[PDB]
């Protein structure tokens, strides 16, 4: 199992523009298009992303291509993030995946704000972090997804994903 799979599980795959759990226009494998309330805006941002006149629908390959870009960008962002980098580097491979998941869902900034948890993760205080991580909006909004990631950080395994 790996990040792509892991994120393909949490995010799903949709070939037609849709609203995310927050109501934002999204497409593909959790590819946010816009925070705008306008579907035209989203159709536009879509076409710009694809390089074609899509009409709110893309192929799977297209989806996968956006997905690749997004994973790459997320990593790269993390690595350029002073609060993030260090934690990331301290982690083992599985847990790194858990962090990237979060980052993809929530944005580096979003994630860089879980200071306490971040710190606990860095100290490898798994149970503590898992509890800390759970005191969050994120957990309360998307409990299941959140629990998956939390287990992964706590256990260092893919269990939650099997």
151 is an interface residue for Cl ion by CB under 5 A: no
155 is an interface residue for Cl ion by CB under 5 A: no
Smallest distance from the beta carbon of 124 to Cl ion, in angstroms?
26
Q: What are phi and psi of 37, to 5 degrees?
A: -75, -15
148 is an interface residue for Cl ion by CB under 5 A: no
Binding residue (CB under 5 A) for Cl ion from 43, 145, 148, 154: 145
H-assigned helices in the chain: 3-11, 39-50, 60-79, 84-90, 93-112, 115-122, 126-134, 137-141, 143-155
142 is an interface residue for Cl ion by CB under 5 A: yes
Binding residue (CB under 5 A) for Cl ion from 7, 27, 32, 49: 49
Smallest distance from the beta carbon of 87 to Cl ion, in angstroms?
23
153 marked as part of a ligand binding site = no
User: For residue 8, what are its two tokens?
Assistant: 């393909």
Can 11 be counted among the known catalytic residues? yes
Closest C-alpha among 37, 107, 102 to residue 77: 107
36 marked as part of a ligand binding site = no
Measured distance CA(86)–CA(28) in Å, rounded: 31
Go through the chain and tell me how many residues it has: 162
- Candidates 34-42, 49-57, 80-88, 151-159 — which segment interacts with Cl ion by CB under 5 A? 49-57
Residues 6+ apart with CB under 8 A from 23: none
Can 22 be counted among the known catalytic residues? no
Catalytic residue ranges: 11, 20
């Amino acid at each position: 199992m790996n990040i792509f799979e892991m994120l393909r599980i949490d995010e799903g795959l949709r070939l037609k523009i849709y609203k995310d759990t927050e109501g934002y226009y999204t497409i593909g494998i959790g590819h946010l298009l816009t925070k705008s309330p306008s579907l035209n805006a989203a159709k536009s941002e879509l076409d710009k992303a694809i390089g074609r006149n899509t009409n709110g629908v893309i192929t799977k390959d297209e989806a996968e291509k956006l997905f690749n870009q997004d994973v790459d960008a997320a990593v790269r962002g993390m690595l350029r993030n002073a609060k993030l980098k260090p934690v990331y580097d301290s982690l083992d491979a599985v847990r790194r995946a858990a962090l990237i998941n979060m980052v993809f869902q929530m944005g580096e900034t979003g994630v860089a704000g879980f200071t306490n948890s971040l710190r606990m993760l860095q100290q490898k205080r798994w149970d503590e972090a898992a509890v800390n991580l759970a005191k969050s909006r994120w957990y309360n909004q998307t409990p299941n997804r959140a629990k998956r990631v939390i287990t992964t950080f706590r256990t260092g395994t893919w269990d939650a994903y099997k």
